[PDB]
Structures are given as C-alpha cells and as structure tokens.
Amino acid sequence: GEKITKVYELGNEPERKLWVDRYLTFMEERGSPVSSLPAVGKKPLDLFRLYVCVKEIGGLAQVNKNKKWRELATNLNVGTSSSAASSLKKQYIQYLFAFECKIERGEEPPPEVF
C-alpha cells in the first residue's frame, strides 16, 4: 500500500527520474494509470530496478528463455521460492512489458481501431 511517488525515492540513479516520468505518463495515457507501488507478497516492487535488471538480461522473452525469474526474485529480495518467481514474472508482465515494447523496440500499439 505504498504511493507510486515512492518509486522516485527508492534510489537516486541519474536515469531514474526520467524513466519514471516516461513510465507513469505512458501508463496514464494508455488508460492503465499506476497509483500505488505494485507488490509481491509484502514487498513493494521498485519498478525501475526491476526494469533495469530485466533489461540487463535482455527483456521478458530472454528472461523466459533463460529461466531467470528465480534468480531475479532472489537477487531483488522478493523471495527464493518458485511462487515468488512466478509472482514477479506476473508483475513484470502486468506493469512493465507494454512499456518494454514501447521503449526497447519502438513498438507503438496500433491505434485501437480494428
């Protein structure tokens, strides 16, 4: 139950502020605004760190192929269990994958027309 503004405060990496500004605006404009920090169990998720760590591996598809969700959950202190790994993957898909597509591959969700 932490306010999303806490994500600006979880660290002061030079690139964090711009990333968060871009991310929250991206989410508000697509109709899925984020108001609270997502969590896995009782752990608030530092979305910026999670995004950066997944990017290091090469994105969602690469983490899936290399089966690195348990390593990520362990290294981010989310948990060492298979369930913590699956919960972390779920939160990445729900909160960050659409953004990954936009930022890493210039993907621009085809205008909702069809």
PDB file of C-alpha atoms in Angstrom:
ATOM      1  CA  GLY A   1       0.000   0.000   0.000  1.00  0.00           C
ATOM      2  CA  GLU A   2       2.784   2.453  -0.849  1.00  0.00           C
ATOM      3  CA  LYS A   3       2.096   5.531  -3.001  1.00  0.00           C
ATOM      4  CA  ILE A   4       3.588   5.337  -6.513  1.00  0.00           C
ATOM      5  CA  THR A   5       5.583   8.530  -5.798  1.00  0.00           C
ATOM      6  CA  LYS A   6       7.799   6.350  -3.606  1.00  0.00           C
ATOM      7  CA  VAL A   7       9.364   4.973  -6.780  1.00  0.00           C
ATOM      8  CA  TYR A   8      11.107   8.336  -7.299  1.00  0.00           C
ATOM      9  CA  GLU A   9      12.551   7.943  -3.795  1.00  0.00           C
ATOM     10  CA  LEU A  10      13.735   4.318  -3.805  1.00  0.00           C
ATOM     11  CA  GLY A  11      17.001   5.410  -5.386  1.00  0.00           C
ATOM     12  CA  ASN A  12      18.658   8.431  -6.963  1.00  0.00           C
ATOM     13  CA  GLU A  13      20.303   6.872 -10.020  1.00  0.00           C
ATOM     14  CA  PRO A  14      20.699   9.680 -12.595  1.00  0.00           C
ATOM     15  CA  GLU A  15      18.377   7.920 -15.052  1.00  0.00           C
ATOM     16  CA  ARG A  16      15.623   7.050 -12.579  1.00  0.00           C
ATOM     17  CA  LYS A  17      13.713  10.326 -12.685  1.00  0.00           C
ATOM     18  CA  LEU A  18      13.381  10.430 -16.493  1.00  0.00           C
ATOM     19  CA  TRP A  19      12.491   6.729 -16.645  1.00  0.00           C
ATOM     20  CA  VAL A  20       9.764   7.150 -14.031  1.00  0.00           C
ATOM     21  CA  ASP A  21       8.383  10.293 -15.682  1.00  0.00           C
ATOM     22  CA  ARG A  22       8.206   8.458 -19.027  1.00  0.00           C
ATOM     23  CA  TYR A  23       6.757   5.320 -17.475  1.00  0.00           C
ATOM     24  CA  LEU A  24       3.985   6.887 -15.413  1.00  0.00           C
ATOM     25  CA  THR A  25       2.935   9.126 -18.282  1.00  0.00           C
ATOM     26  CA  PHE A  26       2.924   6.139 -20.634  1.00  0.00           C
ATOM     27  CA  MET A  27       0.655   4.286 -18.197  1.00  0.00           C
ATOM     28  CA  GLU A  28      -1.746   7.164 -17.544  1.00  0.00           C
ATOM     29  CA  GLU A  29      -2.203   7.800 -21.244  1.00  0.00           C
ATOM     30  CA  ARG A  30      -2.963   4.208 -22.199  1.00  0.00           C
ATOM     31  CA  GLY A  31      -5.665   4.052 -19.556  1.00  0.00           C
ATOM     32  CA  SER A  32      -3.808   1.916 -17.014  1.00  0.00           C
ATOM     33  CA  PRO A  33      -2.557   4.546 -14.553  1.00  0.00           C
ATOM     34  CA  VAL A  34      -0.454   3.337 -11.646  1.00  0.00           C
ATOM     35  CA  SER A  35      -1.286   4.970  -8.294  1.00  0.00           C
ATOM     36  CA  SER A  36       0.309   2.559  -5.835  1.00  0.00           C
ATOM     37  CA  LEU A  37       3.577   0.660  -5.922  1.00  0.00           C
ATOM     38  CA  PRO A  38       2.890  -2.929  -7.032  1.00  0.00           C
ATOM     39  CA  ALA A  39       3.903  -5.669  -4.615  1.00  0.00           C
ATOM     40  CA  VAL A  40       4.789  -9.335  -4.409  1.00  0.00           C
ATOM     41  CA  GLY A  41       3.668 -10.534  -1.002  1.00  0.00           C
ATOM     42  CA  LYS A  42       4.547  -7.783   1.462  1.00  0.00           C
ATOM     43  CA  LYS A  43       7.334  -6.408  -0.685  1.00  0.00           C
ATOM     44  CA  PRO A  44       6.764  -3.139  -2.608  1.00  0.00           C
ATOM     45  CA  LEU A  45       8.365  -3.501  -6.036  1.00  0.00           C
ATOM     46  CA  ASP A  46      10.969  -0.979  -7.185  1.00  0.00           C
ATOM     47  CA  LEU A  47       9.712  -0.943 -10.782  1.00  0.00           C
ATOM     48  CA  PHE A  48      12.721   0.985 -12.063  1.00  0.00           C
ATOM     49  CA  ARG A  49      15.224  -1.547 -10.646  1.00  0.00           C
ATOM     50  CA  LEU A  50      13.161  -4.452 -11.911  1.00  0.00           C
ATOM     51  CA  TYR A  51      13.039  -2.940 -15.391  1.00  0.00           C
ATOM     52  CA  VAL A  52      16.787  -2.296 -15.390  1.00  0.00           C
ATOM     53  CA  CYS A  53      17.616  -5.817 -14.203  1.00  0.00           C
ATOM     54  CA  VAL A  54      15.339  -7.422 -16.778  1.00  0.00           C
ATOM     55  CA  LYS A  55      16.823  -5.187 -19.470  1.00  0.00           C
ATOM     56  CA  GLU A  56      20.297  -6.410 -18.490  1.00  0.00           C
ATOM     57  CA  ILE A  57      19.170  -9.973 -19.240  1.00  0.00           C
ATOM     58  CA  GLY A  58      17.568  -8.845 -22.485  1.00  0.00           C
ATOM     59  CA  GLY A  59      13.872  -8.346 -21.782  1.00  0.00           C
ATOM     60  CA  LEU A  60      10.872 -10.539 -20.986  1.00  0.00           C
ATOM     61  CA  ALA A  61      11.450 -13.050 -23.779  1.00  0.00           C
ATOM     62  CA  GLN A  62      15.079 -13.522 -22.776  1.00  0.00           C
ATOM     63  CA  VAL A  63      14.298 -13.921 -19.071  1.00  0.00           C
ATOM     64  CA  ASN A  64      11.709 -16.550 -20.033  1.00  0.00           C
ATOM     65  CA  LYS A  65      14.055 -18.447 -22.345  1.00  0.00           C
ATOM     66  CA  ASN A  66      16.905 -18.445 -19.841  1.00  0.00           C
ATOM     67  CA  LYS A  67      14.581 -19.237 -16.924  1.00  0.00           C
ATOM     68  CA  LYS A  68      15.957 -16.354 -14.888  1.00  0.00           C
ATOM     69  CA  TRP A  69      12.885 -15.328 -12.871  1.00  0.00           C
ATOM     70  CA  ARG A  70      14.034 -17.190  -9.749  1.00  0.00           C
ATOM     71  CA  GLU A  71      17.466 -15.554  -9.972  1.00  0.00           C
ATOM     72  CA  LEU A  72      15.809 -12.151 -10.292  1.00  0.00           C
ATOM     73  CA  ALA A  73      13.425 -12.746  -7.377  1.00  0.00           C
ATOM     74  CA  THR A  74      16.361 -13.941  -5.256  1.00  0.00           C
ATOM     75  CA  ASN A  75      18.605 -11.009  -6.178  1.00  0.00           C
ATOM     76  CA  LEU A  76      15.835  -8.434  -5.651  1.00  0.00           C
ATOM     77  CA  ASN A  77      14.946  -9.942  -2.249  1.00  0.00           C
ATOM     78  CA  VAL A  78      11.438 -10.790  -3.420  1.00  0.00           C
ATOM     79  CA  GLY A  79      11.801 -14.435  -2.474  1.00  0.00           C
ATOM     80  CA  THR A  80      13.680 -17.614  -3.242  1.00  0.00           C
ATOM     81  CA  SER A  81      10.679 -19.794  -3.972  1.00  0.00           C
ATOM     82  CA  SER A  82       9.145 -20.894  -7.245  1.00  0.00           C
ATOM     83  CA  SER A  83       5.994 -18.967  -6.271  1.00  0.00           C
ATOM     84  CA  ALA A  84       7.911 -15.715  -5.682  1.00  0.00           C
ATOM     85  CA  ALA A  85       9.492 -16.102  -9.122  1.00  0.00           C
ATOM     86  CA  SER A  86       6.108 -16.622 -10.785  1.00  0.00           C
ATOM     87  CA  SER A  87       4.608 -13.679  -8.900  1.00  0.00           C
ATOM     88  CA  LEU A  88       7.483 -11.433 -10.005  1.00  0.00           C
ATOM     89  CA  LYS A  89       7.081 -12.517 -13.629  1.00  0.00           C
ATOM     90  CA  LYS A  90       3.351 -11.736 -13.377  1.00  0.00           C
ATOM     91  CA  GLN A  91       4.011  -8.245 -12.055  1.00  0.00           C
ATOM     92  CA  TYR A  92       6.559  -7.583 -14.824  1.00  0.00           C
ATOM     93  CA  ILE A  93       4.043  -8.622 -17.471  1.00  0.00           C
ATOM     94  CA  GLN A  94       1.250  -6.595 -15.909  1.00  0.00           C
ATOM     95  CA  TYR A  95       3.180  -3.399 -15.191  1.00  0.00           C
ATOM     96  CA  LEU A  96       6.201  -3.288 -17.442  1.00  0.00           C
ATOM     97  CA  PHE A  97       6.012  -5.389 -20.577  1.00  0.00           C
ATOM     98  CA  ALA A  98       3.933  -2.963 -22.657  1.00  0.00           C
ATOM     99  CA  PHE A  99       6.444  -0.248 -21.701  1.00  0.00           C
ATOM    100  CA  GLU A 100       9.385  -2.516 -22.612  1.00  0.00           C
ATOM    101  CA  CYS A 101       7.869  -2.924 -26.074  1.00  0.00           C
ATOM    102  CA  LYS A 102       7.476   0.831 -26.490  1.00  0.00           C
ATOM    103  CA  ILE A 103      10.921   1.791 -25.131  1.00  0.00           C
ATOM    104  CA  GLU A 104      13.124  -1.041 -26.405  1.00  0.00           C
ATOM    105  CA  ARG A 105      11.517  -1.746 -29.766  1.00  0.00           C
ATOM    106  CA  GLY A 106       9.756   1.490 -30.659  1.00  0.00           C
ATOM    107  CA  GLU A 107       6.573  -0.566 -30.666  1.00  0.00           C
ATOM    108  CA  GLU A 108       3.527   1.698 -30.763  1.00  0.00           C
ATOM    109  CA  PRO A 109       0.348  -0.264 -30.055  1.00  0.00           C
ATOM    110  CA  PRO A 110      -1.612   0.041 -33.304  1.00  0.00           C
ATOM    111  CA  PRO A 111      -4.313   2.681 -32.832  1.00  0.00           C
ATOM    112  CA  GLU A 112      -7.293   0.930 -31.220  1.00  0.00           C
ATOM    113  CA  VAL A 113      -9.381   0.799 -34.406  1.00  0.00           C
ATOM    114  CA  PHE A 114      -9.888  -2.703 -35.885  1.00  0.00           C
TER     115      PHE A 114
END
